[PDB]
Design an enzyme around this catalytic site. Structure first.
Site, short mmCIF file in Angstrom:
data_model
loop_
_atom_site.label_atom_id
_atom_site.label_comp_id
_atom_site.label_asym_id
_atom_site.label_seq_id
_atom_site.Cartn_x
_atom_site.Cartn_y
_atom_site.Cartn_z
N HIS A 260 0.91 -1.14 0.00
CA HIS A 260 0.00 0.00 0.00
C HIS A 260 0.95 1.20 0.00
CE1 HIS A 260 -3.50 2.44 2.00
NE2 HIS A 260 -2.87 3.12 1.06
N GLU B 202 1.44 8.10 -3.87
CA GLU B 202 2.16 7.70 -2.66
C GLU B 202 3.45 8.49 -2.49
OE1 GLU B 202 1.36 5.60 0.01
OE2 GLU B 202 -0.56 6.04 -0.94
N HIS C 39 3.58 10.76 0.71
CA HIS C 39 4.43 10.19 1.74
C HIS C 39 5.93 10.22 1.48
CE1 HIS C 39 1.00 8.63 4.00
NE2 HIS C 39 0.50 8.16 2.87
O1 LIG Z 1 -4.59 -0.02 -4.01
C1 LIG Z 1 -4.88 1.07 -3.54
C2 LIG Z 1 -5.03 1.29 -2.10
C3 LIG Z 1 -5.36 2.57 -1.64
N1 LIG Z 1 -5.54 3.60 -2.49
C4 LIG Z 1 -5.89 4.87 -1.78
O2 LIG Z 1 -7.27 5.41 -2.07
C5 LIG Z 1 -7.38 6.85 -2.45
C6 LIG Z 1 -7.96 6.97 -3.87
O3 LIG Z 1 -8.07 8.36 -4.25
C7 LIG Z 1 -5.90 7.29 -2.40
O4 LIG Z 1 -5.73 8.45 -1.48
P1 LIG Z 1 -6.44 8.61 -0.07
O5 LIG Z 1 -5.90 8.45 1.28
O6 LIG Z 1 -5.59 9.79 0.03
O7 LIG Z 1 -7.63 9.50 -0.19
C8 LIG Z 1 -5.01 6.12 -1.90
O8 LIG Z 1 -4.49 6.46 -0.59
C9 LIG Z 1 -5.41 3.49 -3.91
O9 LIG Z 1 -5.57 4.40 -4.72
N2 LIG Z 1 -5.08 2.21 -4.36
#
Ligand SMILES: O=c1ccn([C@@H]2O[C@H](CO)[C@@H](OP(=O)(O)O)[C@H]2O)c(=O)[nH]1
Length: 190
Positions: free
Chosen positions: A34, A84, A88
């Site tokens: 993740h 990411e 982060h």
């Molecule tokens: O496989 C994954 C797992 C998690 N997300 C998460 O789901 C949100 C989609 O916009 C992303 O930002 P969020 O914390 O900031 O709002 C990302 O953290 C993904 O995109 N893909």
């Protein structure tokens, strides 16, 4: 930053909460990355000013990233990596440039095989109830330190499911340390 949270997600469970629309993760059967989140005094450091995401810096890792760090919610892996990094990765750029950051996540995934550590002890995923103490205990025995367990409750049945497993590392990005925060209760489905 004073540490890192290396977060892996269980695709099937993550997608089980998407009650409408498609979700690529529904068909994956291994833990995937993740993110690698820098920490500071018990909290995640996010959105630090830093360099823009540059795909050319990790071009040599595209095969490993597409396999180990896929976007399980949508069919766009690069967008996930970019998100990411900006949210982060930039917070630990003072010591880990973009190339080193993604390589670090890949190495951590290859050295922290969750299912491999649980399967032999009848703790592998089977859709049944598991004990938090048991799971943390097995991982502690195999890796040496306590992991962090994160769960989510199903709105329909109110049953708790394990969705993410966290491995905590010191600021050097290689020394494992005990995690201290779980969002899982005493029991959950896995
Ligand atoms: O496989 C994954 C797992 C998690 N997300 C998460 O789901 C949100 C989609 O916009 C992303 O930002 P969020 O914390 O900031 O709002 C990302 O953290 C993904 O995109 N893909």
């Amino acid at each position: 930053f004073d540490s890192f949270w290396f977060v892996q997600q269980w695709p099937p469970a993550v997608c089980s909460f998407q009650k409408s629309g498609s979700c690529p993760g529904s068909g994956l059967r291994t833990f995937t990355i993740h993110g690698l989140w820098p920490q500071q005094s018990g909290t995640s450091l996010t959105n630090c000013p830093g360099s823009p995401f540059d795909i050319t810096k990790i071009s040599h890792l595209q095969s490993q990233l597409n396999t180990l760090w896929p976007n399980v919610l949508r069919a766009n892996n690069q967008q996930f990596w970019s998100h990411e990094w900006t949210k982060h990765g930039t917070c630990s750029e003072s010591t880990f440039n973009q190339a080193a950051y993604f390589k670090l996540a890949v190495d951590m995934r290859n050295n922290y095989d969750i299912i491999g550590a649980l399967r032999p002890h009848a703790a592998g995923p089977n859709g049944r109830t598991k004990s938090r103490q048991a799971i943390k205990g097995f991982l502690k025995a195999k890796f040496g330190k306590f992991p962090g367990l994160r769960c989510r409750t199903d709105p329909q049945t109110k049953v708790s499911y394990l969705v993410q497993v966290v491995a905590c590392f010191a600021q050097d990005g290689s020394t494992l340390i005990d995690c201290t925060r779980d969002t899982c209760g005493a029991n959950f489905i896995f």
